[PDB]
Design a protein around this ligand. Structure first.
Ligand SMILES: [Zn+2]
Ligand SMILES: [Zn+2]
Lengths: 263, 141, 287, 275, 121
RNA sequence: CAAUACGCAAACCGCCUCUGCCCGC
RNA sequence: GUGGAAAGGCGGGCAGAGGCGGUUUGCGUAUUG
């Protein structure tokens, strides 16, 4: 069950910009009609000119299985089929970024919970995955429960633009669509778990470079030397920026491809 | 191709012997050089089946570093002369390929007899597997 | 409905790998240089071992087939074999067909009775175990993982090898094209200590349930135990150390009153030989 | 579909080498005991390769009795890169062509692949014989202990013609006369056709006594001589009672060609009553 | 350069008993020892035979070692008697010795000599 | 009068292609 | 004078099927010191 709960950030600072009752009644109504009216037309499957292409496991159905629980005007809480809520969050954010003229942003905190789960825990964990994606940069999406080092240099939830290029690189080369994998990568779903084991060596020791050759060898034995060129080599640009290595970002982009297959 | 095998090897050999001890640098250097080690061994054949006796000799006492013994004398004896026995049994066109692989490990083995046993041989064994792993990635096995 | 407890017949012994033994599991876990077909080895010692699933599975799959052949006449001996016919459910995708092999695991078909009442009478699943929706008969045997004997630990200490690398090749019939490979197998003659515990739940039917275990073992000595197997790589042989009864009065008190059967220098076929009434005769006195 | 089990015909015996043998320049040896030994794959993969070649010539005589020989013309897929076509050798392993029928019901009907087993894509039919390794015999275990050399060495030479340039090497062969002990167990699964597979396995053995066993072979490195000891049957009732209810077939002084020939039908006569 | 070899001849005369060194000296002897393969294999492979195996064979292992230098005459005794002069002073000790132990350090010395023989040529 | 000049192996072939978590709360 | 009391994350599953260490190459020839 794919729960998402996201809200507009810095909105209380935005309504203090208005300086008359003519101006505040407008800005609190155009902001009102996005999460009231125009979020219905997104889920109905419209506006491809405005949105473009989202990180999407399969193209949008005619009658999607989405249940809008609540959507207030600053806030929303939407449940649904857990790989369409994944598609919807990048489809809500993209349409919100053109409804506003590129000025206000969302912070969507995605969770994934089983059907046998009480709702008072689903709202509890997702709202904490929200405040994880709120206190860091206020323009960033949480996607999957992900393990991190205890340094503080490594922040969890993905920036919106930073994630949607990780889908453009990693996904159309290891995933084809509709819950199946690319050519000759089937009977190698054990590989992508092993590739997420080498990410778990980066977490016990970030300083080790044991992940650099294990990345190159496992692609060698399986004959898949062409996939993942960003992961086989270290980035000297990423060391001096004190940003995570490209094996840190690969966890969330692999799991969505992996969970969309039966795994 | 082979023109990279002439230039990059002669760029790396003076850097090879000048760091003869296996405890040269635990930082990003020994992994950055190790790709260049397999970069001029790429254009050579470098078959692994003759090395399987040496690597299993490195394997069977890698557990014995790990609370097995505190003596790597009897193992590292067996690694020195068999690696000389590698050209000492196999000659030919694979000999010119295996002479360049001889000159990196033989400075590091002589450290390991008088070295620490928990340390400085792990720093060798990590440089052992860095040579093999990229060699599978450039197209050799 | 009515699960009881009377003791645990413990079968202690030593598995002797007469031919090279091969099991095989995962490789390349934070590791680069291997032979790429390694027998499962536990990480704390780095020695090979026979697992329990590789022995309980092969004792099971050699005892589906014996039942599958004599399905016709054992409906009187054992009820709930009248739900079955000899054959597979493979030609028509049904989890309950008329035939015997009824449950789809992933893409293969393994006999598991669907209920507690159906598996209570079935000769296979009353011993090795069963499953279902909401009914779920659990097993009786605990086949434990077998490790090397006190002797063969020291041959790893003294310096003798325990795994051998056999090179096999494939050949075209026309151009004689050699297609080689390597296998890591256990050195022939190594010896693992197994232990098979039989949880005696009903005193009505343990004689006809120990005999079924010694039937699946006596087939395993003629068949192979895992690995390539049809080309020699199995050939395993049970060497029984001691049968022990471990009664109910043992567990409360602690007295060494457990009934020990005599199985010193006997084959697995010699226990089931005429004398099974004499080897386990003093177990009848305790019931 | 419908794997069954009636018993396991056990073919004990002793492989004899009248002429010196080679496997593979050392002959491979048992590590725990030091002795050389004839493996399993060199005795099951040798009988298959002297039976896939024998079936290749005769696709007109066996096709009336065996189905799924009509699905192949006698040939080879070595020039034409096609997996399953009219030519008889269909599987490219990596570079070699071995006849494996790609289905259960093709291999159920095949005369080779019902006996020497067959892989497949989602079919994977399994074998009916299991061929075990052959170590030394207990009277020849003791010549190793007595120092009477169980092996030997051999220096050949390779003559370049023009300069008469001798290029010698040292082969290492098992000495001629050394005797092993083999083991083939036939898993009787289908009572309709086992008259075939016992007269069909001995077919592959009889061509082997004319051919070589491992090594070079065209120079002297073969000469198997199967000395049989006793067939037994091991019925399903043998594994429940544990008796000596296994029907002994007398072949103490008989040959592979002396069982497959007249003398067959009286030996296996009590097994037919046991089916 | 024969005096530096004669300086190594004192090192061959240094290891009178068996336990010469557990460290680099067995190699450092053997580097200078190896500074014809086909004449020695009735000791080289004969060492491989007796390792797995004893006492009555070691006399033959000493009898064949003098049978090599007693066969080849002329210019073919010089390095023959030299290589004779290394092995027997480590084999006169090893008659009354442990067999599975105490021989390994020569069994690893015997193999190390031919190893650098093919590298230097 | 009897031998010594020289050769201890070269090659290619190195894994393959099928399967990869269900059931029940 | 305790948001407490009682509650096994587990019942069923062989890393298995198929595969020749292989093919050719004559312990020899050339002349003298
Ligand atoms: Zn059942
Ligand atoms: Zn076939």
């Amino acid at each position: 069950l794919g729960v998402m709960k996201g809200d507009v950030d810095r909105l209380g600072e935005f309504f203090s910009s208005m300086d008359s009752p003519s101006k505040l009644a407008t800005a609190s109504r155009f902001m009102d009609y996005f999460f009231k009216g125009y979020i219905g037309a997104i889920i109905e499957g419209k506006f491809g000119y405005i949105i473009g292409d989202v990180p999407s496991l399969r193209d949008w159905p005619e009658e999607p299985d989405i249940v809008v629980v609540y959507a207030g005007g600053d806030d929303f809480f939407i449940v649904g089929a857990w790989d369409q809520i994944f598609e919807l969050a990048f489809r809500v954010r993209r349409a919100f970024n053109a409804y506003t003229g590129g000025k206000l942003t969302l912070s969507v905190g995605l969770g994934y919970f089983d059907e046998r789960t009480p709702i008072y825990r689903m709202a509890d964990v997702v709202s904490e995955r929200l405040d994880t994606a709120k206190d860091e940069g206020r323009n960033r999406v949480f996607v999957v429960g992900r393990s991190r080092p205890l340094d503080g240099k490594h922040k969890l939830s993905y920036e919106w633009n930073h994630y949607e290029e990780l889908w453009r690189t990693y996904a159309p080369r290891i995933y084809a669509g509709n819950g199946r994998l690319k050519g000759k990568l089937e009977s190698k779903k054990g590989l992508l778990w092993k590739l997420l084991e080498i990410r778990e060596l980066y977490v016990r020791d970030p300083n080790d470079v044991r992940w650099a050759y294990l990345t190159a060898y496992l692609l060698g034995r399986h004959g898949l030397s062409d996939l993942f060129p960003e992961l086989v080599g270290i980035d000297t640009k990423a060391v001096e920026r004190k940003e995570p290595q490209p094996v840190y970002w690969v966890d969330g982009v692999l799991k969505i491809v992996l969970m969309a297959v039966r795994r | 191709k082979g023109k990279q095998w002439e230039a990059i090897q002669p760029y790396f050999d003076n850097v090879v012997r000048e760091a003869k001890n296996f405890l040269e640098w635990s930082p990003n250097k020994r992994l950055a050089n190790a790709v260049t080690v397999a970069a001029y061994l790429t254009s050579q054949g470098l078959k692994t089946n003759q090395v399987r006796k040496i690597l299993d000799m490195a394997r069977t006492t890698e557990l014995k570093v790990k609370r097995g013994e505190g003596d790597i004398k009897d193992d590292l004896v067996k690694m020195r002369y068999l690696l000389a026995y590698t050209v000492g049994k196999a000659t030919g066109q694979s000999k010119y390929s295996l002479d360049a692989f001889h000159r990196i490990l033989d400075p590091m083995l002589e450290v390991l007899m008088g070295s620490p046993k928990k340390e400085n041989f792990e720093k060798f064994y990590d440089f052992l597997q860095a040579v093999v792993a990229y060699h599978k990635f450039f197209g050799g096995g | 409905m009515d699960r009881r407890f009377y003791g645990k017949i413990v079968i202690k012994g030593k598995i002797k790998a007469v031919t090279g033994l091969h099991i095989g599991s995962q490789r390349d876990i934070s590791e680069i240089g291997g032979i790429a077909n390694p027998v499962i080895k536990d990480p704390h010692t780095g020695l090979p071992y026979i697992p329990g699933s590789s022995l309980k599975g092969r004792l099971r799959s050699l005892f589906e087939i014996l039942v599958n052949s004599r399905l016709g006449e054992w409906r009187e001996k054992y009820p709930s074999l009248a739900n079955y016919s000899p054959g597979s459910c493979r030609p028509d995708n049904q989890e309950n067909c008329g035939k015997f092999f009824n449950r789809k695991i992933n893409r293969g078909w393994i006999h598991v009775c669907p209920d507690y009442e159906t598996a209570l009478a079935c000769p296979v699943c009353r011993l090795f175990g069963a499953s279902g929706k909401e009914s779920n008969f659990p097993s009786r045997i605990i086949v434990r993982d077998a490790f090397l004997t006190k002797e063969w630990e020291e041959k790893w200490r003294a310096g003798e090898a325990i795994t051998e690398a056999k090179i096999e090749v494939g050949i075209d019939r026309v151009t004689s094209q050699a297609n080689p490979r390597t296998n890591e197998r256990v050195v022939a003659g190594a010896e693992f200590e197994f232990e098979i515990i039989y949880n005696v739940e009903n005193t009505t039917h343990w004689r006809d349930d120990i005999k079924n275990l010694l039937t699946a073992m006596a087939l395993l000595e003629d068949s192979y135990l895992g690995g390539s197997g049809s080309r020699g790589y199995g050939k395993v042989k049970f060497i029984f150390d001691s049968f022990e009864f471990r009664p109910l009065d043992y567990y409360r008190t602690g007295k060494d009153e457990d009934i020990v059967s005599i199985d010193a220098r006997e084959k697995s076929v010699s226990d089931i030989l005429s004398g099974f009434d004499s080897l386990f005769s003093e177990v009848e006195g305790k019931l």
